[PDB]
Amino acid sequence: LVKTIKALDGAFTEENRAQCRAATAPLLEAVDNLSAFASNPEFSSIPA
Amino acid sequence: AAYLVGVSDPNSQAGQQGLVEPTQFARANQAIQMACQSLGEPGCTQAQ
Amino acid sequence: PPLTSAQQALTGTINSSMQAVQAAQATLDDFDTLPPLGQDAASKAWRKNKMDESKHEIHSQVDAITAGTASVVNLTAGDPAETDYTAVGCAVTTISSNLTEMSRGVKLLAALLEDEGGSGRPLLQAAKGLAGAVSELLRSAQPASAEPRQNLLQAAGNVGQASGELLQQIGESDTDPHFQDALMQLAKAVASAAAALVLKAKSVAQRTEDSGLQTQVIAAATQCALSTSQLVACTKVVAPTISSPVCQEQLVEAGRLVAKAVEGCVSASQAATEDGQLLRGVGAAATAVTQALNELLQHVKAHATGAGPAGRYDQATDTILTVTENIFSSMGDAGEMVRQARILAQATSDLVNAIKADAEGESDLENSRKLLSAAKILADATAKMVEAAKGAAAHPDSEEQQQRLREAAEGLRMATNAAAQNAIKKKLVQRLEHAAKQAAASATQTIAAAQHAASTPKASAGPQPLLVQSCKAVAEQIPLLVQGVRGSQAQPDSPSAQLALIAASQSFLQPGGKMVAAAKASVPTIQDQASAMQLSQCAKNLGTALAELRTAAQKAQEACGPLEMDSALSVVQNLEKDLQEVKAAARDGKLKPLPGETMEKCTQDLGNSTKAVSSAIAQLLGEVAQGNENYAGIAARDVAGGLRSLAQAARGVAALTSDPAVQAIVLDTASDVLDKASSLIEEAKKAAGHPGDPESQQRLAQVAKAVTQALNRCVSCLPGQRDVDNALRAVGDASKRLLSDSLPPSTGTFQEAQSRLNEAAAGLNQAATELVQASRGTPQDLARASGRFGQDFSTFLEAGVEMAGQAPSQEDRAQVVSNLKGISMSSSKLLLAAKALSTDPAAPNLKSQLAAAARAVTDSINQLITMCTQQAPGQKECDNALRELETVRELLENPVQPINDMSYFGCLD
Structure with a gap:
């Protein structure tokens, strides 16, 4: 995403803006993948 | 502060609270998705 | 005193033990206590579950009684004022501790046997007659009595036989x-060879001329005759318990003592110098220890006949199975038929030189002797097919030559x-059968000791248990392996039942070894000393157990290739076939749930297994993104057991509810x-x-989204939650209309919308305030407040968007809308926290997870109010x-979860 962040920094192009917007969908998947792994309650919390 | 006094009792049992803190992840997963909706807007400045 | 204070404490130990003996028989009369199973096939399977599970529970605890009996005889084998009477009281407690669980154990079996055959009453009277034999054995344990040792020996011998x-x-x-009664052929031969040597020790007594030396021979011989008669009494106890290793040490314990008795007697035989009876006494003492050696040679093979190790390499068997189809495919040619027999003679013999190499690197020789047996079948079958293929190739029209080839x-x-299979599965008979069964009795003996440790103080209020807080955890994990024991016996061929035993072992090792360190930590905590001796003993037995588990774990993981991807699909095939029977069973409408199932508990177990x-x-x-990974079959096996736990949890709440409409809902979801x-x-x-293909990566990702959609169908199918998805739909769909193409029709004046928005925000946070106030209440009250807060948000959403057009610049309006977007998304995650808070109210971290989400929306609305409303009155x-x-x-009302991670002194500053 940084390769498209530095490309869009100062670009102000509408068709070039969707390049980082489409690359965030594998990013938002893997972010929600580990949070789904973090939703496992034996790994999440242990009661006291 | 009042929580740790509850752990201070000898008959009380402490908890490991899992291996990872899930409250840090839910704030992080939300704030990234809060920014991706700002990324989803086609008209925005480079400061945002 | 006539007896020491340890024997005085043993008197109270006897009176405490014998009181529970007759009380266990009196509590036996309330037998059945049976809940109804009904016509449910899962309940019939649960009847099949408790049959095999509780059968091992009685089988586990009787071995420690047989080990506990002869250990008293081994301790009392010495002279008075030479016996650790404190260790004697340790062995009589664990016998009585197993006796308590034997009564409650067969009480479920008496209701079990009444359903099938109703012929369990001889099992009841033999159990009460077995406990009465321990009562007279406890009467023989008194040292103040002048009873002979053989009175104690014959009283203890009937206890071991009636247990069998x-x-x-x-x-x-x-x-x-045939092996149990062969021990009687050895033990009676030992006492006969002892008493013959005792008569040889009595013959040399008249040959002696010195005072004190003649009494030295007979006192060693009478002790040798006592110890060899103790061996007869010990072998009558352990005659069915030859497989249990917890009592095998006590055999060579007295086996060392009769060796001490031989060395004590053979030292006096050499004192009869220049004697004709000196020559026969050494050869008789050599044959006396030979019978103990020849018993011990069979005693190792008594354990070795069930434990057979072999290594299934199968580096040559795959070359055997490929060339077998070339004979039937090339039937009719003489040239191509005789050349394939030479390759099969090399492919079979490539395993023959490796089967003998596997027996050399092996420890025991049961399956390795069967490896010599199995390789001879591979050698003899390849010896008769070369002559059969020779006649079938030269004479193709002969019918007798073709029939011998088939x-x-x-x-x-x-x-x-x-x-191949007997090389690998009898190794698992060595591995897995010795894994769980020795771990089973050692687990519950700690449970029997800790319950005895909790009952040792007068008040059991707050014992601070490191064991009992984990005893209840591991006891649910115990019968998962035991159910797969007989299933591996019933199904030896399919490895999927045996592969589940590998997964059941490693899932038992993590809570198991944590208890053993807590068991050793709880050793000096008890004031009573004799209870801690078994606590020290069982921890060594658990230490003996866990070492063999890891040898069984890593080796059986490497026993086969990673082909668990195809077997994991067959696991859910058994689930959907039973669920279609449950679909027929829920159509009947008379379903009895399990007694362990609870409607408030299992719904939490559904959502925890969902995540x-x-x-x-x-x-x-x-x-999958890596591709061709051995862990892919591991994780596919992991999701099979998760859905299997989800299947019984869905079938648990199906029989608990009574509404037939939602019964079809929880089935179809x-x-x-x-x-x-x-x-x-x-x-x-x-x-x-297909590795490295990005097209298949996005395909199952869209399926997994629909899986989590289907997982959310299991969230929305619960009747406990009331319109919280509708509260999510009222919040979600009204905001998505506000994001795309929303303009207020009437802006009005700025003063009439400022006064309206502040009062509408006042009850908005108050509706959010009662969310944490109803956290202490019922979860249905959270569903009540979800509708009022979700409606008032949409009332606030129309009031918020009405003054959006009152701003002159739309970029100031879009800043307000994006801030209102942050309020709406924070309330959505607050609602996404609410779907688990009403699901799991008991979790304290989930309370503060919603409470921090509750603080997030209240801080996101105060900033936008500061942007929109006028600061010139200053009342805002x-x-x-x-x-x-x-x-x-x-938030101060429920102090169960800390806010941040700073320490005490970091909080003070």
Whole structure:
């Protein structure tokens, strides 16, 4: 995403803006993948 | 502060609270998705 | 005193033990206490569950009684004022501790046997007659009596036989009686060889001429005759318990003592110098220890005949099975038929030189002797097919030459399968049968000791248990392996039952070894000393147990290739077939749930298992993106057991509810999950076959979204939650209309919308305030407040968007809308926290997870009010502060979860 962040920094192009917007969908998947792994309650919390 | 006094009792049992803190992840997963909706807007400045 | 204070404490130990003996028989009369199972096939399977599980529970605890009996005889073998009487009281407690669980154990069996045959009453009277033999054995334990030792020996011998008679009443007499009665052929021969040597020791007594030396021979001989008669009494106890290793040390304990008795007697035989009886006494003492050696040679083979190790390499058997089809495919040519027999003679003999190499690197020689047996079947079948293929190639029209070729092909292919599978599964008989069974009794003996440790103080209020807080955890994990024991015996061929035993072992090792360190930590805590001796003993037995588990764990993991991807699909096939029977059973409408199931508990167990399987789903996608990973079959096995736990949890709440409409809902939501899960493993096999393909990566990712959609159908199918998805739909769909193409029709004046928005925000946070106030209440009250807060948000959403057009610049309006977007998304995550808070109210971290989400929306609305409303009256500064005061007020009401991670001194500054 940084390769498209530095490309869009100062670009102000509408068709070039969707390049980082489409690359965030594998990013938002893997972010929600580990949070789904973090939703496992034996790994999440242990009661006291 | 009042929580740790509850752990201070000898008959009380402490908890490991899992291996990872899930409250840090839910704030992080939300704030990234809060920014991706700002990324989803086609008209925005480079400061945002 | 006549007896020491340890024997005085042993008197109170005897009176405490014998009081529970007769009380256990009196509590036996309330037998059945049986809940109804009904016509439910899962309840009939649960009847099949408790049959095999409780059968091992009685079988486990009787071994410690047989070990506990002869240990008293080994301790009392010495002279008075030479016996640790404190260690004697340790062994009588664990006998009585197993006696307490024997009464309650067969009480469930008396209701069990009444359903099938109703012929359990001889098992009841033999058990009460067995406990009465311990009562007279406890009467023999008094040292103040002048009773002879043989009175104690013959009283203890009937206890070990009637326990095996009770084992014969159970039907789990797994040891063959030709080997048990052969011990009587050895033990009576030992005492005969002793008494013959005692008469030889009595013959040299008249040959002696010195005072004191003649009494030295007879006192060693009478002790040798006492110890060898003790061996007869010990062998009558351990005659069915030859497989139990917890009593095998006591055999060579007295086996060392009779060796001490031989060395004590053979030292006096050399004192008879220049004697004709000196020559016969050394040879008799040499044959006296030979019978103990020849028993011990059979005693090692008594354990070795069930434990057979062998290594299934199968580096040559794969070359055997490929060239077997070339004979039938090339039938009719003389040249091509005789050349394939020379390759099969080399492919079979390539395993023959490796089977003998496997026996050299092996420890025990049961399956290795069967490896010599199985390789001879591979050698003899390849010796008769060369002459059969010679006559079939030179004479193709002969019918007798072709008929002998067909019967010789099946005598090698299945025999190699008999050579391979018996090499690997009898190793698992060595591994897994010795894994769980020795771990079973050692687990519950700690449970019997800790319950005895908790009952040792007068008040059991707050014992601070490191064991009992984990005893209840591990006891649910105990019968998972034991259910797969007889299933591996019933199904030896399919490895999927045995592969589940590998997974059941490693899932038991993590809570198991944590208890053993806590067991050793709890050793000096008890004031009583004799209870801690077994606590020290069982921890060594658990230490003996866990070492053999890891040897069974890593080796059986490497026993076969990673082909668990295809077997994991067959697991859910057994679930959907039973669920279609449950679909027929829920159509009947008379379903009895299990007594362990609770409607408030199992719904929490449904959602916890829902997040558990989806956690491995995201783990499956990372291994799919790598491709050709051995852990892909591991994670597919992990999601099979998660859905299996989800299947019994869905069938648990199906029989608990009474509404027939939602019974079809919870079936159809669960059936659509496994229908989507069937599409997971079908494409993951295509994902494992095709590495580096990005097209299959996005395909199952869209399926896993629909899986979590179908998992959310299992969230929305609960009747406990009331319109919280509708509260999510009222919040969600009204905001998405506000994001895309929303303009207020009437702006009006700025003063009439400023006064309207502050009062509408006042009750908005108050509706959010009662969310944490109803956290202490019922979860249905949270569903009540979800509708009022979701409606008032949409009332506030129309009031917020009405003054959006009152701003002159739309970029100031879009800043307000994006800030209102941040309020709406924070309330959505507050609602996403509410779907688990009403699900799991008991979790304290989930309370503060919603409470921090409750503080997030209240801080996101005070900033936008500061942007929109006028600061010139100055009353809005008090208005933003009064909302945050009430939010932190009820946060102080429930101090169960800390806010941040700073320490005590970091909080003071």
